[PDB]
């Protein structure tokens, strides 16, 4: 028989062996319809790198083993597509001459030469090498397609109306992660996803994506929205969803009550802090925040409001009108303080403080009149208020609820800036009223806007 047999295959760059002898090298002897596996004492397998960097597999029969007449001996082993084959079928690598039958990526050669060497004869034998004439071809598996979905949410979640400006499209890029030390290819595939008003979800797919790599996605930062990118598939079958969710805004409104002068301006301060307690800085709409502080100037031309557009989710806000802007007003607040998790409106109301006017009438000498005022909480007034008689402005001071004025016939004093919802009584002093019958109009009353009391002094 023939002896000193060896079978050799040189594998192309398009295939490779499996890890850890999973290739399961074996030589089967087939004769008369029976099959048996040569043992380790009958054959040895070696793997080597050739000088051109290819893997060469040899089955070396034990040297004195002779092939049985008419038996088929067949070397079997498994290979898998190399990265090169997976790249070529995704269209990421050009073929060169020799790579595949008719340069078709569905017909990559598995071998770059294969042959058998053997000897025959007793004594000084003869040695022959024959090349296999078959050049088999294979098709790697289909490349991937990778779905990508873009979803737009309003401030309070999916399907909720969006109010912010949106671009007309978003360019999405599939990033092929480098697995051999190099840099990620961040432009591996790209797609433009249409963006239309009130269409929340739109889908595209990257085509012919090479297997063998991990992938990620780049999607643009869109002003007014936060961006979340998820792989809703697996590592080996990625599928991506980008969610753009509109950021919340804080509107500060000013309301005037009982105030006929609409030309005033007011400064309203807003304090803005993060849950983490980093100082907040940035420009939000028209309103710049420095170190957690912003100041909004409201007037009629701006519709009595300012907007901090697209603040970070969960920002703590506290609204306060500046002290100088509160003079002459009772100032109340709605939604003064909170956490910004949806759009919020914070309202400052400036209710002009009421005044009390007292007129002296004489029918038929200065007359002394006492004014008692108790505040909204029922406590006697103490403080000094501007009072005007005939365009002379004087301070009028209340002590323990009481002030006194002096009026001539037909004079009016008007006392400004008194507390909202306080109660007044006026009473002419006994000495002033001697010789006169005294009558009153609106002797008592509630300071819930401008009031007028009249003291009437009728001789006798």
């Amino acid at each position: 028989g023939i002896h000193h047999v060896s079978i050799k295959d040189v594998l192309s760059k398009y295939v490779q062996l499996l890890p850890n002898g999973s290739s399961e090298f074996r030589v089967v002897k087939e004769k008369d319809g029976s099959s048996e596996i040569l043992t380790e004492n009958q054959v040895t397998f070696d793997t080597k790198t050739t000088s051109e960097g290819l893997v060469e597999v040899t089955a070396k029969f034990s040297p004195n083993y002779s092939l049985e007449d008419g038996a088929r001996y067949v070397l079997k082993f498994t290979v898998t597509s190399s990265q090169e084959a997976l790249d070529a079928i995704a269209g990421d690598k050009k073929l060169e001459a020799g790579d595949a039958e008719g340069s078709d990526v569905n017909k990559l050669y598995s071998n770059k030469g294969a042959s058998v060497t053997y000897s025959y004869g007793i004594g000084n034998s003869q040695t022959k090498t024959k090349e296999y004439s078959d050049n088999p071809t294979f098709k790697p598996s289909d490349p991937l397609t990778v779905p990508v979905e873009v979803e737009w949410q309003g401030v309070t979640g999916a399907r909720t109306v969006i109010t912010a400006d949106q671009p007309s499209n978003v360019e999405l890029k599939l990033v092929q992660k480098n697995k051999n030390g190099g840099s990620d290819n961040q432009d591996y595939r790209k797609t433009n996803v249409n963006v239309s008003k009130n269409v929340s979800n739109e889908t595209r797919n990257f085509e012919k994506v090479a297997k063998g790599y991990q992938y990620d996605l780049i999607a643009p930062d869109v002003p007014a929205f936060t961006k979340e990118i998820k792989n809703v598939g697996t590592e080996s079958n990625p599928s991506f969803k980008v969610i753009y969710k509109q950021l919340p805004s804080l509107t500060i409104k000013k309301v005037l009550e009982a105030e006929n002068n609409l030309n005033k301006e007011f400064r309203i301060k807003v304090k803005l802090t993060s849950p983490d307690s980093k100082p907040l800085n940035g420009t939000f709409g028209e309103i710049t925040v420095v170190n957690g502080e912003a100041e909004i100037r409201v007037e009629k031309r701006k519709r009595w409001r300012g907007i901090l557009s697209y603040l970070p989710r969960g920002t703590h806000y506290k609204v306060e009108e500046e002290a100088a802007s509160t003079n002459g007003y009772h100032v109340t607040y709605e939604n003064q303080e909170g956490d910004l998790n949806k759009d919020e409106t914070s309202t400052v109301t400036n209710h002009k403080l009421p005044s009390l006017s007292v007129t002296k009438k004489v029918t038929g000498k200065s007359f002394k009149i006492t004014i008692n005022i108790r505040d909204a909480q029922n406590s006697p007034l103490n403080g000094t208020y501007t009072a005007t008689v005939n365009n002379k402005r004087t301070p009028l001071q209340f002590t323990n609820g009481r002030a006194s004025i002096d009026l001539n016939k037909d004079q009016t004093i008007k006392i400004d800036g008194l507390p909202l919802d306080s109660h007044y009584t006026v009473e002419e002093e006994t000495n002033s009223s001697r010789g006169y019958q005294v009558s009153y109009e609106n002797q008592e009353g509630k300071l819930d806007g401008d009031k007028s009391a009249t003291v009437t002094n009728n001789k006798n």
Binding site: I2, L75, K76, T78, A114, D134
Partner: peptide, 30 residues
């Protein structure tokens, strides 16, 4: 000298993507 015939094939392994079995044979007649 003995006559030898050589056949080489590659076959996809059914139900396993990207896996193929190579077969390199030799038969000898006296």
């Amino acid at each position: 000298e003995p006559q030898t015939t050589l056949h080489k094939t590659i076959t996809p392994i059914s139900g396993q993507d990207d896996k193929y079995e190579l077969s390199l044979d030799i038969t000898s007649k006296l």
